Amino acid sequence: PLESQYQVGPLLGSGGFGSVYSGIRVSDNLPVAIKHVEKDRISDWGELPNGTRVPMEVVLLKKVSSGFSGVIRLLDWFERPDSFVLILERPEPVQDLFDFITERGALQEELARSFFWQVLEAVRHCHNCGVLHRDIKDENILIDLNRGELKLIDFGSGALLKDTVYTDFDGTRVYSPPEWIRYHRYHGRSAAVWSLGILLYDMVCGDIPFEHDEEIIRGQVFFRQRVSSECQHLIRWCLALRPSDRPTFEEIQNHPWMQDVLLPQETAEIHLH
């Protein structure tokens, strides 16, 4: 009986994903986030192990939730007559990467290196668990300001990871690869790398590199900020027009720009406190 198990607070945000509120677990005052999603608005349905009809989002969240704190964990969920309700963990204090970039402008490379690495680790974690996120971007990353740790949120556009083609996509267009725009087909990992290339550019330039389909399709990267050559190179690499020309996760993290990352705690002490 959820209404009495959590104390609902202010609304945090709403959109295609639905509506998300601040809340507190009544038992221990654990800070939580309470997400509501309308059944009619749910395009993708999944099967629970015990065989149940449920939003794919819940399926993916269960698969990725455990010790690794690179992803935001699903604590519980409930079915309502016309909606599902998800209880998710909530860091406090917290701020999303989009708001942070808007606040702070372009980020220092040292800090961008830490953040990007943390994301890479998290995305690698989902892939390890058979989950593909499909909407990696600043708005879908949270920053625990005290610990300097980044957390992935919003698995509402995700899918089970597979090695065959995807012919559906419903994440953010300006973050989608050339081959989606052109052919409406992509492969999971190589698409994810492209979006990672967008995200990295966004961290270091304070903005997204492409706005229209034709810019995406052309794939020429102009840098509007001072950015090291290594970083430019890594970014150009992730944004290769041919998917098979993109680096693997291992190649990204072995890149020279990616060397000597700060620990999250260091990161907070230096860049966050």
Ligand SMILES: Cc1[nH]nc2cnc(-c3cccnc3)cc12
């Ligand atoms: C502020 C916050 N803490 N824990 C969260 C989990 N999820 C979300 C979220 C935001 C947008 C869409 N879906 C989930 C937001 C969250």
